[PDB]
Amino acid sequence: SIRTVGIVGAGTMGNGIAQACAVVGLNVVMVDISDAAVQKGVATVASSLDRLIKKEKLTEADKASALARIKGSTSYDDLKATDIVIEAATENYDLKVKILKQIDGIVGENVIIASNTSSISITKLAAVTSRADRFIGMHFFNPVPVMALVELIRGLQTSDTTHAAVEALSKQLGKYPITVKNSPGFVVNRILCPMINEAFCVLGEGLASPEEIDEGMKLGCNHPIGPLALADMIGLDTMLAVMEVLYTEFADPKYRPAMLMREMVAAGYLGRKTGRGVYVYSK
């Protein structure tokens, strides 16, 4: 079975995943390079759980219960106590690799190594481990506890068995699994992000004003938020790189980045995070 889940990385996703298991009563070994890192991982899940109890989401006891369920370490040997390990610590490739080799170094031959990512080739990663068939990809979503889905991304090597394990693991977390053959942008970003790009093109060609562009899509297609606004929250540098990945991996100008998107990024106009992207923001 799987009752104990390794996590490498105690940043946003890390605890994100940690929490999500814990409340389901799952044992989590959560590693990260400092004791500063690990415990701050706990602070956000603490702070986060506080909020939930404060809108009657059960309870003070289910809280304590979960927290207990979570063994946060700096020894990566603690991942021997684990059924499966989710690297959730970086999107640098070189670094990502090292970690998975390291992880592959500790755990047993029949322990599954998954890696969370938006962009990186699961198949390229899987092949650095010693048992690829036990390697699978996941893509959790940005507020990881409340968001009820994950992309399950099969490397060319991932086994049927590794898949179902990880598939059911997710159902048990209350997320909807989405199985996807490894491919640039998988499913969600693959169709969402080029749509966002098209918006920049429309704006770029001065066909309409941004606000109006967002209005058109909110009201016309009943999307909760318009793509330009949406882009400002994601980060245009992030948007640009996604598209750069699609063009580069597919080798197809169909996915050309929008030039205005290039210009805004070159200028440092990156969205909410720089205070300026498509719109301008308080701070």
Place this chain on the structure above:
Amino acid sequence: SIRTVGIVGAGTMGNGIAQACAVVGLNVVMVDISDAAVQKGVATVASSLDRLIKKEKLTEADKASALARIKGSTSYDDLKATDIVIEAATENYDLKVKILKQIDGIVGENVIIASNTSSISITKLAAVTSRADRFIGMHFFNPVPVMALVELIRGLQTSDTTHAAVEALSKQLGKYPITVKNSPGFVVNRILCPMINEAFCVLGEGLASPEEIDEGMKLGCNHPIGPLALADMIGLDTMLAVMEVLYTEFADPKYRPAMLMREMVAAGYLGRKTGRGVYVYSK
């Protein structure tokens, strides 16, 4: 001012627009080729208004009041009594033209002719009338009373004056105007529909299952409906033609139709309307 609005076409859009004016207390001359056509136009606005009163949307008196406000004729000379005329009767080009020439034939030099369309070049249309600057494009949305927006599409010729008139006319209908330089797919379809296409590509490459593809987008990006399902409601033949328009008008393979979308259409699998598109449906 504008207190009397011509409408050519008493089909779905036609009354759609008719109604929308009427409830705002606006005088509507609604023409169509038979008395069968005109009155059936009234039946749907009748039936439709019934429903509204039946969920406390005011009232039996505001109803009667509106209906009165609506003078439905078969004489296209009745469009002399009108401030502006909205052709809303076909998406055939040859036929569309004739109508606007005919309309242009009746009304005065300072009366505005607008044409509702999703696909047709406003600038190409405008140039068949005798005063292009008085010609403008509109794109109302499929349930035309409740949907609170319109794309206002300027031909290269549309005047600033024609624009503001028609802009304010819309605000008065309680729709949000969206100003758009004439261009293939304008704003809404231009970015929405290629997104839908990308979905067919993903499905086409067997990366994921349709249901899962729809799930991914519903949950991941909080869209009310997934694009494949969405495509089944629009009609794949309609989707295909939109994309055919983008590729053909832009002259750019970036907008290549999705091959699976071509195959489904060639097969007659067109969606809800044929009972089979991406999914299969009751009847």
